[PDB]
Amino acid sequence: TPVVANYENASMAADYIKRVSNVLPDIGIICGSGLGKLIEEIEERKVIPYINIPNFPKTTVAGHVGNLVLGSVGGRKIVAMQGRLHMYEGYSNQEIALPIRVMKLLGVRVLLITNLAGGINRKLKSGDFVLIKGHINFPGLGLNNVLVGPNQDEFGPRFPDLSNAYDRLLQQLALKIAQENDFQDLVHEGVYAFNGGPTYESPDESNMLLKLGCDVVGMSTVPEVIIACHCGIKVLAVSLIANNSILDAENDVSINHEKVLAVAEKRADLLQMWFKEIITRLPLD
Amino acid sequence: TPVVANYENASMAADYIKRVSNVLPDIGIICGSGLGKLIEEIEERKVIPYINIPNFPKTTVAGHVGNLVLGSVGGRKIVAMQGRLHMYEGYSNQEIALPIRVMKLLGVRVLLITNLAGGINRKLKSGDFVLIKGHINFPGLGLNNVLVGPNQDEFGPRFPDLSNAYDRLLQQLALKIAQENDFQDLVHEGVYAFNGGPTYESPDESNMLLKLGCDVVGMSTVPEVIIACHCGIKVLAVSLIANNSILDAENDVSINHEKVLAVAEKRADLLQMWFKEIITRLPLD
Amino acid sequence: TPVVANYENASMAADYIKRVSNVLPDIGIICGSGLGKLIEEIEERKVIPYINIPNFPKTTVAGHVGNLVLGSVGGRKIVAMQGRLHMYEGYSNQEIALPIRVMKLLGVRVLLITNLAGGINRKLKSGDFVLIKGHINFPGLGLNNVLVGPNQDEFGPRFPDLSNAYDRLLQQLALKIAQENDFQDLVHEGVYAFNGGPTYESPDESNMLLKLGCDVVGMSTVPEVIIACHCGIKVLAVSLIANNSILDAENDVSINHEKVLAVAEKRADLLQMWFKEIITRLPLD
Ligand SMILES: O=P(O)(O)O[C@H]1O[C@H](CO)[C@@H](O)[C@H]1O
Ligand SMILES: O=P(O)(O)O[C@H]1O[C@H](CO)[C@@H](O)[C@H]1O
Ligand SMILES: O=P(O)(O)O[C@H]1O[C@H](CO)[C@@H](O)[C@H]1O
Ligand SMILES: Nc1ccnc(=O)[nH]1
Ligand SMILES: Nc1ccnc(=O)[nH]1
Ligand SMILES: Nc1ccnc(=O)[nH]1
C-alpha cells in the first residue's frame, strides 16, 4: 500500500523469519554507506531478501541490496539490515518503522547503528568517529517525524521522551574499547543534526548548524533511533566523519559520495573490529 | 478522501449543525490535554459527534472523544471542539482546516485556544500560563504549513500576514482578569515554537529553541491559529507549562504524558474559571 | 498521477515542444511575481500552454497563466515559464522537477531566476536587489527537499553538492551590468531562506532568520535551483526586496501581496532591461 507498521503486520513478518532461520537475535545492526563488511562475516548466517518477507517495504525502485541477515557474531545472536532504508528515497513512516518493529518482535533489545556524516564541530577531521549523544531532528520539528500517524500502542507510547534515546553505558563501552586499542584519539561525542536530504548540507546550512549546537550532520539514523526508542530498544549510534563541512565552506571545497565512500573504505576494517568487540562485550541484560 | 476544506463542503457541515442546534455561536473554543472541563459546563448544550457531521474528518483511527458541543457560557453562544485534531496523528491540511472554517460559517469571530507545552524560557515553571504573542512554525518553514495546497479564496487570501494573528486586546483582557483574581504571578507572555511531534523536543532541540528566541514549545495550536487568521477570526492562545525542558535537560529529567496530565489537573479548575470570565467579558464587537 | 519526472516522460514533453517550435533554447528563465514582462517581449515567440504539453503538471486548480514561451532575446534562444509553479500550492516534487528537466533536454545550460522576497539583513530596503549566493533550505532539512524520492540517474547524482549552485561568474556579470548603468547602489548579495509558505514569515520567524545568517526570505527559487544543479544547469537567482521584515516586526507594519506587487511594478522595467542585457552578454560557453 505500503502496509501499516502495526502489530499484526510486524508479527506476520517475524513469523516468516522465525520459520526460515532458527536465530532468535538479541542485537540488531544497521550499517552506514560502505560500512557493511561485518554483515558478510556473520557466522552460520541466513540471508533473507526483503522481497521474500511478508509486509517488508518494497525497495526495487531504489534497487541495490536488500536483505535481512541473521546469525552469530562474537558469540551473540544478531540480525542485520543489509541495505538501509533512507527517508530521502521516499519511504514512508510505515516503511521505515516496520523492520525495526520486526526486530523488536524477534527479540532485539540493543540496536547498533553506523552512518557517514559531515563534521560541523571544528574539532572533527575526516576519518574521525563521533558517538552520538543527542540529536536535532529537523524533519521531526517540521511535521515529518517518523512517528507521525496513528500510534501503534502495542509497540510504545503516543509521546516518547528522547532524552535517553542514546544509551550512556553503550557510549561508555564503545569508548572503553577504543581506549583499549589506542584509537581513542579518533573518538569524539556529539549532537547529530538530521538533514532529510538528499542534497548535502549547503555551506550556509552548515554555518547555521554550527550556530545551533550541532556537531555532525547526516541523512539517516534519527528515524531508526526514534522507532527503537519508542519500542524500548537501546541504541548506540556512531558517525564516521567524511569531511568537515565548516572548513569546506571556508575553503570552497566540494563534497561528493565518492569522497564519502573513500573515507568509509579507510575506516571500514577498524569500525568492523570495534563493533565486533562491542557486540561481544555489551551487557547480556 | 479526505474531502477538501472548501466553501461548499464547509457549508454542508454548517447546514447540518444549524439544523441540529439552534445555536449560532459567536465564540469557538479548542482545549488542551486535560483542559476540557469547561465544555462539560456549557449550558443548554447540544453534543454533535463529528462522525454525524457531513464532511467532518474521520477520527476513528485515533479514537477517543470527537464531538462538536454548542451552547451558552457566561451569556455568550459558543461552539467547542471536544477532541482536538493534532497534526502528529496524520490529519491532512484539509482535515484540520474544515472544522475551523465551519466555525467561521456558523458565526464564530473569536477563537480561544489552550494547550499544554514545554517551557524553554528560564523564567517558566510547571503550572505557569503563557499568553502566546507570536510563534515559530517549523512545519510552515519546512513546506508543511497547514495552508499548503490550493487557496480557498472564499475564506481568505493566498498569502496571510501573521503579525497580528494573536489579538493584543484579548491578551490584555486575559491578563487583566488574572490580575483581578491575584494569579498574575503565574501569567507570562511568550513565543510558541511548533514542534510537529509526537516525540517531545529532545534536550538538544530544547537548547536550540532557547537560542532561537522561543519561550515555549508544543505540538498544536499554530495550525488552528493560521486557519483562523486566514479567515479573519481573532485568536487568544494560552499555554499551560507542563515542565521546563531546559532545566530538565540540565538535570537529566524525563517528560511524559502522565506528568503533563498531572499539571493539567492541577490548573484545570483555575483555567476553566479564567476562560469563563474571558468569554463573559470579551468585547461584543 | 502526477507522472514521475523521469527520462522517458521529460523526453516525451521535449519531443512535443521541438515539434511545435523550432527553437532550441540555450537559456531558461523563471520570473517572480509581477516580473514577467520580459516574456511578453520575446521575439519570434511561440506560446505553448502547459496543458498542451505531454506530462506537464496540471495547474488548473490554481488557475492563472501557464505557458512555456520560446523565442529570442538579445540574439539568444530562450525558453520561459510563464506562470511559475510554487510548492505552497501543493505541487509535488515530480511536478516541480519535470519542467526544469525538459529545459535540460531542450538544450538549456543557464537558468535565470527572479523572485520577490522579504528583507532580513538590516541593510536591505524595499526595491533593492539581492544576488543570491547561497541558501538555507528549511524544507530540505525537514524531509521536504524537492529531490526526495527515487533518483533519476539520467539527470544527475543521488547526492548533489550545492556549494556551487549559484554560479559566481553570473553574479559577477549581473553586478558589472548594474555598475555600467549606475544602479549598483541597489544591488547586494545574500543568503536566501526558503520558507515553504504560503503565510509570510511571522515576526518571530524573521527574528530567528536574522540570528541564523539569512539575508532574505521567500517561498520559491530553491526547488528550481536544486533541480537545475542536479542536472548541471548553471543558475543566477535575483531577489527583489518587497519589504524589510525585521523593521516591520519592530514597527508593527504588515505585509501583503498588494504591497509586494507594487514593489514589483516599481522595479519591473529596470529588472527587464538588466536581464535582457545579462542574456545578451552571458558567456556563450
Ligand atoms: O547515513 P548513511 O547511511 O551512512 O549514508 C550517508 O551517506 C550518504 C551521503 O553520502 C547518505 O546516505 C548519508 O545518510
Ligand atoms: O497541545 P495540547 O493539545 O494541549 O497537547 C499537548 O500535550 C500532548 C503531549 O503531552 C500533545 O498533544 C501536545 O500538543
Ligand atoms: O518568489 P516569487 O515567485 O516572486 O513569489 C513570491 O511573492 C509571493 C508572496 O507575496 C510568493 O509567491 C513568493 O514566492
Ligand atoms: N557531508 C556529508 C557526508 C556524508 N553524509 C552527509 O549527510 N553529509
Ligand atoms: N514538554 C512538553 C509538554 C507538553 N507538550 C509538549 O509538546 N512538550
Ligand atoms: N515579505 C515577503 C515578500 C515576498 N515574499 C515573501 O516570501 N516574503
Tab-separated table of C-alpha atoms in Angstrom, chain B:
chain	number	residue	atom	x	y	z
B	1	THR	CA	-10.993	11.190	0.632
B	2	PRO	CA	-10.322	13.291	2.888
B	3	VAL	CA	-12.571	15.975	1.433
B	4	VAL	CA	-11.283	19.454	0.589
B	5	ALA	CA	-11.892	22.212	3.170
B	6	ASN	CA	-13.685	24.291	0.555
B	7	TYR	CA	-16.678	26.607	0.693
B	8	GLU	CA	-19.214	24.001	-0.467
B	9	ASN	CA	-18.063	21.294	1.943
B	10	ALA	CA	-17.855	23.609	4.950
B	11	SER	CA	-21.332	24.959	4.107
B	12	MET	CA	-22.782	21.439	4.051
B	13	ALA	CA	-21.395	20.777	7.528
B	14	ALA	CA	-22.648	24.132	8.831
B	15	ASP	CA	-26.109	23.449	7.366
B	16	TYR	CA	-26.293	20.184	9.305
B	17	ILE	CA	-25.133	21.804	12.556
B	18	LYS	CA	-27.651	24.641	12.217
B	19	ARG	CA	-30.436	22.091	11.739
B	20	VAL	CA	-29.454	20.041	14.798
B	21	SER	CA	-28.868	23.041	17.102
B	22	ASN	CA	-30.430	26.489	17.087
B	23	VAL	CA	-27.180	27.905	18.479
B	24	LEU	CA	-25.486	30.488	16.308
B	25	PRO	CA	-22.134	30.674	18.120
B	26	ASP	CA	-20.028	33.823	18.349
B	27	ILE	CA	-17.015	32.228	20.075
B	28	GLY	CA	-15.140	28.997	19.368
B	29	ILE	CA	-13.020	27.099	21.894
B	30	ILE	CA	-10.378	24.384	21.455
B	31	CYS	CA	-8.986	22.980	24.688
B	32	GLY	CA	-5.667	21.388	25.562
B	33	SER	CA	-4.866	17.977	27.017
B	34	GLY	CA	-6.819	17.559	30.263
B	35	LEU	CA	-8.250	21.088	29.966
B	36	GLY	CA	-11.706	20.300	28.616
B	37	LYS	CA	-13.922	20.586	31.696
B	38	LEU	CA	-15.455	23.906	30.574
B	39	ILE	CA	-17.032	22.015	27.657
B	40	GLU	CA	-18.897	19.843	30.168
B	41	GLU	CA	-20.283	23.025	31.788
B	42	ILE	CA	-21.702	24.553	28.596
B	43	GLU	CA	-25.325	25.423	29.335
B	44	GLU	CA	-28.273	24.174	27.273
B	45	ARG	CA	-25.685	22.170	25.403
B	46	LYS	CA	-26.013	20.160	22.200
B	47	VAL	CA	-23.413	17.434	21.629
B	48	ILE	CA	-22.883	16.550	17.962
B	49	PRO	CA	-20.480	13.655	17.207
B	50	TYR	CA	-18.013	14.560	14.463
B	51	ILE	CA	-18.953	11.283	12.774
B	52	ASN	CA	-22.522	12.603	12.335
B	53	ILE	CA	-21.493	15.880	10.646
B	54	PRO	CA	-21.198	15.843	6.822
B	55	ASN	CA	-17.578	16.297	5.681
B	56	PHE	CA	-16.044	16.303	9.178
B	57	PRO	CA	-12.722	14.431	9.311
B	58	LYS	CA	-12.710	10.760	10.247
B	59	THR	CA	-11.174	10.334	13.706
B	60	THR	CA	-11.863	6.651	14.424
B	61	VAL	CA	-8.281	5.515	13.810
B	62	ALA	CA	-7.067	7.672	16.697
B	63	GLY	CA	-10.331	7.005	18.524
B	64	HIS	CA	-11.284	8.809	21.725
B	65	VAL	CA	-13.861	11.593	22.003
B	66	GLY	CA	-14.798	13.626	18.940
B	67	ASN	CA	-17.790	15.934	19.393
B	68	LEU	CA	-18.776	19.456	18.464
B	69	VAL	CA	-20.530	20.973	21.501
B	70	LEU	CA	-22.739	24.068	21.210
B	71	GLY	CA	-24.480	26.103	23.887
B	72	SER	CA	-24.027	29.032	26.233
B	73	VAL	CA	-21.245	30.089	28.595
B	74	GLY	CA	-21.428	33.337	30.537
B	75	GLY	CA	-24.339	34.590	28.453
B	76	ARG	CA	-22.478	34.017	25.170
B	77	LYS	CA	-23.176	31.459	22.452
B	78	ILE	CA	-20.195	29.167	21.912
B	79	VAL	CA	-19.038	26.142	19.930
B	80	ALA	CA	-16.316	23.820	21.267
B	81	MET	CA	-14.248	21.067	19.688
B	82	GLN	CA	-14.302	18.202	22.205
B	83	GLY	CA	-11.407	16.098	20.982
B	84	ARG	CA	-8.820	18.250	19.261
B	85	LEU	CA	-7.260	17.247	15.940
B	86	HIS	CA	-3.452	17.163	16.141
B	87	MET	CA	-1.304	17.027	13.021
B	88	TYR	CA	1.070	14.412	14.524
B	89	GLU	CA	-1.857	11.983	14.126
B	90	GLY	CA	-1.534	12.308	10.359
B	91	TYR	CA	-4.553	14.538	9.730
B	92	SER	CA	-4.148	16.432	6.496
B	93	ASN	CA	-4.246	20.173	5.957
B	94	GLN	CA	-7.820	19.798	4.703
B	95	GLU	CA	-8.917	17.851	7.775
B	96	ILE	CA	-7.513	20.463	10.161
B	97	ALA	CA	-8.959	23.403	8.254
B	98	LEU	CA	-12.534	22.204	7.756
B	99	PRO	CA	-13.767	22.429	11.385
B	100	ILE	CA	-12.373	25.948	11.814
B	101	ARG	CA	-13.936	27.079	8.541
B	102	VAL	CA	-17.241	25.566	9.684
B	103	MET	CA	-16.890	27.644	12.863
B	104	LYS	CA	-16.453	30.707	10.645
B	105	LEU	CA	-19.606	29.949	8.647
B	106	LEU	CA	-21.548	29.339	11.879
B	107	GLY	CA	-20.695	32.872	13.042
B	108	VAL	CA	-17.518	32.496	15.114
B	109	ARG	CA	-15.476	35.687	15.286
B	110	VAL	CA	-13.189	34.828	18.257
B	111	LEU	CA	-11.363	31.523	18.878
B	112	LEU	CA	-9.977	30.764	22.351
B	113	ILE	CA	-7.301	28.052	22.493
B	114	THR	CA	-5.433	26.314	25.303
B	115	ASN	CA	-2.586	23.822	25.130
B	116	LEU	CA	-0.006	22.069	27.296
B	117	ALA	CA	3.557	22.994	26.389
B	118	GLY	CA	7.177	22.678	27.449
B	119	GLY	CA	8.894	25.713	28.931
B	120	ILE	CA	12.027	26.995	27.220
B	121	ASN	CA	12.363	30.432	28.819
B	122	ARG	CA	14.224	30.080	32.096
B	123	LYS	CA	11.537	32.141	33.872
B	124	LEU	CA	8.855	29.468	33.312
B	125	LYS	CA	7.872	26.900	35.951
B	126	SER	CA	5.491	23.970	35.783
B	127	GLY	CA	1.957	25.237	36.234
B	128	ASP	CA	2.628	28.691	34.756
B	129	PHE	CA	0.490	30.162	31.962
B	130	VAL	CA	1.911	31.800	28.829
B	131	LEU	CA	-0.173	34.147	26.707
B	132	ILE	CA	1.071	33.402	23.193
B	133	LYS	CA	2.156	36.578	21.392
B	134	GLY	CA	3.821	35.024	18.324
B	135	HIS	CA	5.162	31.760	17.005
B	136	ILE	CA	7.946	29.927	15.202
B	137	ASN	CA	6.287	27.467	12.829
B	138	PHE	CA	8.862	24.821	11.925
B	139	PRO	CA	6.355	22.846	9.817
B	140	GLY	CA	5.466	26.038	7.934
B	141	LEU	CA	9.059	26.917	7.162
B	142	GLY	CA	9.566	23.303	6.057
B	143	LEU	CA	6.714	23.005	3.461
B	144	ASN	CA	4.192	21.511	5.929
B	145	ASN	CA	2.262	24.722	6.629
B	146	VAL	CA	-1.427	23.979	7.237
B	147	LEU	CA	-2.256	26.206	4.221
B	148	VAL	CA	-0.138	24.292	1.681
B	149	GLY	CA	-2.491	23.407	-1.157
B	150	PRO	CA	-4.850	25.436	-3.325
B	151	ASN	CA	-6.127	28.580	-1.677
B	152	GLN	CA	-9.810	28.615	-0.728
B	153	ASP	CA	-10.499	32.197	-1.773
B	154	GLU	CA	-13.926	32.386	-0.123
B	155	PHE	CA	-12.192	32.069	3.256
B	156	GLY	CA	-9.096	34.219	2.896
B	157	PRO	CA	-6.084	35.359	0.903
B	158	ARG	CA	-3.391	33.254	-0.717
B	159	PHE	CA	-0.649	34.845	1.452
B	160	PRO	CA	-1.787	35.695	5.004
B	161	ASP	CA	0.238	38.008	7.215
B	162	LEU	CA	0.525	36.562	10.727
B	163	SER	CA	1.960	39.615	12.502
B	164	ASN	CA	-1.476	40.233	14.090
B	165	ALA	CA	-2.565	36.588	14.463
B	166	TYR	CA	-2.636	36.785	18.297
B	167	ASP	CA	-5.005	39.641	19.180
B	168	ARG	CA	-3.367	42.120	21.556
B	169	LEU	CA	-6.606	43.271	23.209
B	170	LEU	CA	-7.508	39.660	24.039
B	171	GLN	CA	-4.114	39.116	25.672
B	172	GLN	CA	-4.652	42.322	27.651
B	173	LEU	CA	-8.117	41.186	28.778
B	174	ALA	CA	-6.810	37.769	29.835
B	175	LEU	CA	-4.074	39.437	31.880
B	176	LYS	CA	-6.499	41.927	33.439
B	177	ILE	CA	-8.697	39.067	34.687
B	178	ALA	CA	-5.677	37.270	36.148
B	179	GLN	CA	-4.742	40.491	37.962
B	180	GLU	CA	-8.311	40.864	39.280
B	181	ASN	CA	-8.095	37.350	40.760
B	182	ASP	CA	-4.493	37.737	42.016
B	183	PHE	CA	-2.959	34.972	39.904
B	184	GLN	CA	-0.999	37.281	37.597
B	185	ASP	CA	2.225	35.912	39.132
B	186	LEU	CA	1.500	32.743	37.125
B	187	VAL	CA	0.988	34.604	33.821
B	188	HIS	CA	3.713	35.368	31.264
B	189	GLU	CA	3.762	36.165	27.567
B	190	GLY	CA	5.882	34.345	25.049
B	191	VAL	CA	6.709	32.975	21.614
B	192	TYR	CA	5.438	29.451	20.857
B	193	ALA	CA	7.570	27.013	18.850
B	194	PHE	CA	5.533	24.444	16.911
B	195	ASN	CA	7.220	21.027	17.099
B	196	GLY	CA	5.222	18.782	14.782
B	197	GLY	CA	5.742	15.870	17.172
B	198	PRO	CA	4.774	13.401	18.520
B	199	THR	CA	8.130	12.920	20.270
B	200	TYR	CA	8.813	15.588	22.861
B	201	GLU	CA	11.536	18.059	21.960
B	202	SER	CA	14.897	16.401	22.543
B	203	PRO	CA	17.292	18.025	25.039
B	204	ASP	CA	19.419	19.365	22.190
B	205	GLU	CA	16.343	20.625	20.358
B	206	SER	CA	15.325	22.450	23.538
B	207	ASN	CA	18.743	24.089	23.713
B	208	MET	CA	18.396	25.123	20.077
B	209	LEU	CA	14.949	26.627	20.713
B	210	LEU	CA	16.355	28.743	23.533
B	211	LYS	CA	18.997	30.156	21.179
B	212	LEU	CA	16.321	30.985	18.583
B	213	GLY	CA	14.101	33.098	20.848
B	214	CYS	CA	11.432	30.527	21.724
B	215	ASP	CA	9.696	30.717	25.085
B	216	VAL	CA	7.547	27.551	24.930
B	217	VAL	CA	7.273	24.524	22.625
B	218	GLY	CA	4.313	22.308	21.811
B	219	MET	CA	2.657	20.165	19.162
B	220	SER	CA	-0.581	22.020	18.454
B	221	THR	CA	-2.221	25.421	18.164
B	222	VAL	CA	-0.268	27.006	15.292
B	223	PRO	CA	-2.285	25.146	12.584
B	224	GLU	CA	-5.608	26.348	14.040
B	225	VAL	CA	-4.247	29.865	14.578
B	226	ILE	CA	-3.276	30.036	10.913
B	227	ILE	CA	-6.634	28.783	9.621
B	228	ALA	CA	-8.426	31.232	11.934
B	229	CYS	CA	-6.208	34.156	10.886
B	230	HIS	CA	-6.710	33.266	7.215
B	231	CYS	CA	-10.491	33.603	7.606
B	232	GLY	CA	-10.472	36.640	9.918
B	233	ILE	CA	-11.185	35.007	13.287
B	234	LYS	CA	-9.379	36.651	16.205
B	235	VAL	CA	-7.386	34.333	18.462
B	236	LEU	CA	-6.298	34.108	22.081
B	237	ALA	CA	-3.963	31.167	22.761
B	238	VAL	CA	-2.714	30.236	26.237
B	239	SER	CA	-0.106	27.585	27.026
B	240	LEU	CA	-0.034	25.774	30.353
B	241	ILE	CA	3.573	24.877	31.134
B	242	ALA	CA	3.989	21.189	31.962
B	243	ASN	CA	7.726	21.343	32.663
B	244	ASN	CA	10.827	23.373	31.949
B	245	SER	CA	12.619	21.488	29.189
B	246	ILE	CA	15.826	23.491	29.580
B	247	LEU	CA	16.119	22.662	33.283
B	248	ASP	CA	15.149	19.057	32.537
B	249	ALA	CA	17.984	18.853	30.002
B	250	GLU	CA	20.455	20.207	32.543
B	251	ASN	CA	19.227	17.783	35.227
B	252	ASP	CA	18.540	14.677	33.074
B	253	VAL	CA	14.850	14.689	33.995
B	254	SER	CA	12.410	12.972	31.656
B	255	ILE	CA	8.996	14.117	30.479
B	256	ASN	CA	5.934	12.002	29.816
B	257	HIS	CA	2.244	12.450	29.174
B	258	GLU	CA	1.312	11.347	32.699
B	259	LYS	CA	3.329	14.253	34.123
B	260	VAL	CA	1.707	16.561	31.558
B	261	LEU	CA	-1.799	15.476	32.538
B	262	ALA	CA	-0.992	15.885	36.233
B	263	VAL	CA	-0.113	19.547	35.640
B	264	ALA	CA	-3.314	19.897	33.611
B	265	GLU	CA	-5.313	18.535	36.553
B	266	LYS	CA	-3.549	20.921	38.945
B	267	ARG	CA	-4.569	24.000	36.895
B	268	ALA	CA	-7.748	22.789	35.158
B	269	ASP	CA	-10.231	24.441	37.523
B	270	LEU	CA	-8.431	27.797	37.556
B	271	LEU	CA	-8.114	27.802	33.772
B	272	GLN	CA	-11.817	26.978	33.444
B	273	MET	CA	-12.782	29.909	35.670
B	274	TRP	CA	-10.394	32.243	33.832
B	275	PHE	CA	-11.736	31.309	30.401
B	276	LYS	CA	-15.342	31.527	31.607
B	277	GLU	CA	-14.664	35.107	32.704
B	278	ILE	CA	-12.854	35.886	29.427
B	279	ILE	CA	-15.883	34.642	27.457
B	280	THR	CA	-18.220	36.719	29.630
B	281	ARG	CA	-16.086	39.861	29.227
B	282	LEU	CA	-14.676	39.786	25.697
B	283	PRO	CA	-15.924	42.738	23.628
B	284	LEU	CA	-19.215	42.068	21.843
B	285	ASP	CA	-17.857	43.634	18.640
